[PDB]
């Protein structure tokens, strides 16, 4: 193999890392194999793939299982103080499997979020364009775009013999001069692997947020009119009628700001306000009674949309920042071996956060479906 020299040989070589990080990879392995296997068993065998979201959720669990197969290799690798005994062929597959799963899992969530924007906001107009054939062709393109993105992890990932410590490792060699590796390889994982997809994931669920808000606020406006109309019928003085009629005029304007006679209702409420203000109590109740039910509603859907976005953001944002810090060292913006140590120490920590939350994504998205939750609890019971 090749014999190279490490600029900062003591960077990232800490005993608490060589003991804790392999333990974390074991926790991710057992939980990941357990959770992602049940997702495949429930979807592919108990539901037979009947929707577009089921195709994405199936491939989201299959992609995580492929990454978990290479996880025991990295566990014993970090356990032996970064020593690679599996050869040069097994590293190119392992390093590609991690890069492949990063792009694939994030691309699937991007398309799954776009599917939710169309299924909730445009149910009738986007149904003929969202079929089973489209979901399968979308996934095979995602497999190609992820494999194309993990392509440098197959070409430039070689096994090197470090002469400083006589330790055989596999890595990218950020040569100071005459390097065949691309300059900004970590930049691709930033924009293509996080920045661009997150802005689509954030935009999709924000439009779902705004659509459900206009629909829920409209129902509360109608519920305000009906509840206040019953207050006027049960009122006994002009003060109670004045309070309910003012709340109905305000609710009519909010319901109008969601071509017809909304000004007719608002004008007739304003006519009733002219009677209740002049001490007339019985006359205002007659005009209110002359003017003027079981829809599903989940007021906790906004907490769900909030959790979905922040779970994708806070899980990847530790790994994507130190990835960007790795690029600054590669370009030559920073050459200090002190900041290279805090980057080499925090990289195993961020991977244990991003890839642990990512292996629980097919399980969390499954529990949102009421039918999926039914089959999942039957297997455990």
């Amino acid at each position: 193999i090749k014999r190279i020299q490490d600029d900062c040989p003591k960077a990232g070589r800490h005993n608490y890392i060589f003991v804790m990080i392999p333990t974390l990879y074991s926790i991710i392995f057992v939980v990941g194999i357990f959770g992602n296997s049940l997702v495949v068993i429930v979807i592919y065998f108990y539901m037979k793939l009947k929707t577009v979201a089921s195709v994405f959720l199936l491939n989201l669990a299959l992609a995580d299982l492929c990454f978990l197969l290479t996880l025991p290799l990295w566990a014993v690798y970090t356990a032996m103080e970064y020593r690679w005994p599996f050869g040069n062929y097994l590293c190119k597959i392992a390093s590609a499997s991690v890069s492949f799963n990063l792009y694939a899992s994030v691309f699937l969530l991007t398309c799954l979020s776009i599917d939710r924007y169309l299924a909730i906001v445009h149910p009738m107009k986007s149904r003929l364009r969202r079929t089973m054939l489209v979901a399968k062709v979308t996934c095979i393109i995602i497999w190609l775009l992820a494999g194309l993105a993990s392509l440098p992890a197959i070409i430039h990932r070689n096994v090197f013999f470090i002469e400083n410590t006589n330790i055989t490792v596999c890595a990218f060699h950020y040569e100071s001069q005459n390097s065949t590796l691309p300059i900004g390889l970590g930049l691709t994982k930033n924009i293509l692997g996080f920045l661009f997809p997150f802005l689509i994931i954030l935009t999709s669920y924000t439009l779902i947020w705004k659509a459900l808000k206009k629909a829920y606020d409209l129902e509360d406006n109608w519920e305000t009119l009906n509840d206040n109309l019953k207050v006027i019928e049960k009122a006994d003085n002009a003060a109670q009628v004045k309070d309910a009629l003012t709340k109905m005029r305000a609710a009519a304007l909010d319901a109008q700001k969601a071509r017809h006679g909304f000004d007719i209702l608002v004008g007739q409420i304003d006519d009733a306000l002219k009677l209740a203000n002049e001490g007339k109590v019985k006359e205002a109740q007659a005009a209110a009674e002359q003017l003027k039910k079981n829809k599903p509603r989940n007021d906790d859907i906004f907490k769900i949309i909030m959790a979905i976005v922040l779970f994708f953001f806070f899980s990847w944002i530790p790994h994507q920042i130190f990835t960007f810090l790795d690029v600054l060292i590669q370009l030559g913006i920073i050459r200090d071996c002190r900041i290279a140590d805090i980057v080499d120490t925090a990289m195993p920590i961020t991977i244990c956060i991003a890839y642990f939350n990512n292996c629980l994504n097919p399980l969390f998205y499954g529990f949102l479906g009421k039918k999926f939750k039914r089959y999942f609890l039957q297997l455990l019971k």
């Binding site: 190279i4 990295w74 060699h173 950020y174 195993p348």
Partner: peptide, 8 residues
């Protein structure tokens, strides 16, 4: 140069 011996 530097050695990025982390899994991706």
């Amino acid at each position: 140069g530097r050695v990025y011996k982390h899994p991706a």
